[PDB]
């Protein structure tokens, strides 16, 4: 329901090359709008949505500076993390951070977050109150004390309540013709052979935005998600999304099943069945 601005950072160690790679991407809701890649020659923050291109040179210059500095600290940090976990230099390891703000209906911060992971495991996270940290193990406790001594939480809280929300608001207006116009799914049902005593009915939702959607199968109003195949919502490639839900039903019994679609761009729930 509420809009969000989020950034996703990935740093990976490369032992063979004796260096690391840092990749940052930025999103408004389900729409990517910037990237940074330390591996790119002369790396800069680059536009990845058309509406962000109207930002001036000061924006691209200053965003690029931020990422270059962040890239270096995440590279050095990979070295620390290997020492914390008694790891050799032979293996590759992965450090991630994500952070963002959700826009409340009053224009205030609904919820902000800042979290970190190492080799796919929660490492440290800013608590809901935006004033303290939770560390996952004895290694993360080293980081927590460093950040407490340096008062890092106050800066993260200031960013999340302030610049994050005001940036979100500026971006939503700049790209309002796409970011604030919900595209409803194009829906249909198909039938396919399955096995003895059973044909498959597949309910398609195609070309919708934003990503959140509800696809359910009902047999006389009763939810069938137990025997249902529900695929992960997937990108269309043009900024919209797709999803389907499929169910095996008895032959001749097709018309006793209904597919129900809920989407923000529909404004009224839909029912449909096999034709």
């Amino acid at each position: 329901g509420p809009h969000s601005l989020s950034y996703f950072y990935t740093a990976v160690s490369r032992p063979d090359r004796g260096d690391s790679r840092f990749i940052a991407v930025g999103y408004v809701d389900d729409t990517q709008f910037v990237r940074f890649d330390s591996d790119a020659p002369n790396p800069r923050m680059e536009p990845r949505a058309p509406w962000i291109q109207q930002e001036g040179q000061d924006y691209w210059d200053r965003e690029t500076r931020k990422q270059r500095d962040t890239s270096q600290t995440y590279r050095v940090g990979l070295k620390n993390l290997r020492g914390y976990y008694n790891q050799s230099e032979a293996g590759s390891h992965t450090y991630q951070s994500m952070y963002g703000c959700y826009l409340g209906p009053d224009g205030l911060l609904l919820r902000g977050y800042r979290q970190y992971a190492y080799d796919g495991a929660d490492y440290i996270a800013l608590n809901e109150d935006l004033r303290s940290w939770t560390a996952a193990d004895t290694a993360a406790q080293i980081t927590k004390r460093k950040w407490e001594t340096a008062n890092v939480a106050e800066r993260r809280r200031s960013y999340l309540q302030g610049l994050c929300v005001e940036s979100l608001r500026e971006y939503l207006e700049m790209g309002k013709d796409t970011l604030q116009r919900a595209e409803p799914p194009k829906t249909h049902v198909t039938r396919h052979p399955s096995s003895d005593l059973g044909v498959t009915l597949r309910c398609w939702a195609l070309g919708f935005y934003p990503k959140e959607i509800s696809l359910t199968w009902q047999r006389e109003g009763q939810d069938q998600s137990q025997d249902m195949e529900l695929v992960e919502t997937r990108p269309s490639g043009d900024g919209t999304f797709q999803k389907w839900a499929a169910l095996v039903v008895p032959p001749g019994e097709e018309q006793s099943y209904t597919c129900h679609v809920q989407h923000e761009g529909l404004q009224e729930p839909l029912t449909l069945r096999w034709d």
């Binding site: 965003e63 800042r114 980081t143 800066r155 610049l163 994050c164």
Partner: peptide
């Protein structure tokens, strides 16, 4: 706009 401040594990 990205968060600026020094980020050191």
């Amino acid at each position: 706009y990205g968060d600026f401040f020094h980020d050191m594990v």
